[PDB]
């Protein structure tokens, strides 16, 4: 009987967990809530993230991962244990093979601590890899070839970019300008320009429905509702795709600067791959309309949007099961 394979994409806003033979058992916010002063779990994932607004006083909300940052290693273990509890199987960790994908900001100390933590839970083997390496494999890139792979992952709380060659990361950097920032900046733009406060969900909907980085085949506008800034009264206004496009382009100056920084670090041996093969784009924001065209216009290299951008990291972990088992 083979050892169970467990993959955890720690993620930047949501975590995703996969168990061999079960599939993906967790995919939502990296948040948990307890009755105050206890470890009595009242909500996990989305059910807990909702309450961040005004939590019931007899309830404490914990955020083990804030934009991909580990807030506390003991709190991170609680969260990992809650994920494994989803399997509803006694001793899910015993003798298992565990792969954890994490942002590069997770220090070597924290990665080694998570290895000891999972081994203490019962794992036979624990391996920690960077999310950009797994995202490229999940999105369909041959990360094991000596050819240069150039990856950009726009998630919820981090945007990362890197160069991959021969199964490993050659260089990678990350910034804080990502999906959550974009939603909040849409909110702030509409408050300043239309004197109405919208909720985060309306901001996300604006992004999805009419947001773009490049002038497409359809001109759209949108009716939205929010709180009038002066009076507080519910108020309606129309938002044009052109003003949101201008806003998104301004935000993405940070993301094109990140790609420029990575491209400026390309070794001479891989420069041809950058020019001829170009960029692969994954993450939740990879589906912003016109992103391919916007990036191709700026960098004059090919850009490819991943087929599975929302799940590239965990899909790569799932594909990486063979490599771990093979090399064993
Ligand atoms: Ca800017």
Residue numbers in the entry: 17 to 344
Paper text:
The crystal structures of nucleotide-free (Nf) SpeMreB3 and its AMPPNP complex were determined at 1.90 and 1.75 Å resolution. The Nf-SpeMreB3 crystal belongs to the space group P21 and contains a single molecule in an asymmetric unit. Nf-SpeMreB3 forms protofilaments along the crystal a axis in the P21 crystal. Thus, the protofilaments are arranged in an antiparallel manner. The interaction between IIA and IB' (with and without a prime indicating i and i-1 subunits, respectively), which has been observed in CcMreB, TmMreB and SciMreB5 protofilaments, is not found in the Nf-SpeMreB3 protofilament, whereas the IIA-IIB' interaction is conserved in Nf-SpeMreB3. This IIA-IIB’ interaction is mediated by a hydrogen-bonding network and is stabilized by an electrostatic interaction between E285 and the N-terminal end of the α-helix starting from V216'. Nf-SpeMreB3 had larger ω1 and φ values than SpeMreB3-AMPPNP complex Mol-A (4.6° and 3.5°, respectively), showing a wider nucleotide-binding cleft and a more uneven overall conformation. While our Nf-SpeMreB3 crystal structure forms a protofilament, we suppose that ATP binding is necessary to polymerize SpeMreB3, since filaments were not observed in the absence of nucleotides under solution conditions. Although some intra-protofilament interactions along the filament axis were observed in Nf-SpeMreB3, the interaction area is smaller than that in SpeMreB3-AMPPNP. This difference is derived from domain closure upon AMPPNP binding, suggesting that this conformational change is necessary to form filaments in solution.
MreB is a bacterial protein belonging to the actin superfamily. This protein polymerizes into an antiparallel double-stranded filament that determines cell shape by maintaining cell wall synthesis. Here, we studied MreB3 and MreB5 in Spiroplasma eriocheiris (SpeMreB3 and SpeMreB5, respectively), a model organism for studying Spiroplasma swimming. SpeMreB3 adopts a canonical actin fold composed of four subdomains (IA, IB, IIA and IIB) and consists of the same secondary structure elements as CcMreB, Thermotoga maritima (Tm) MreB and SciMreB5, except for the C-terminal region.
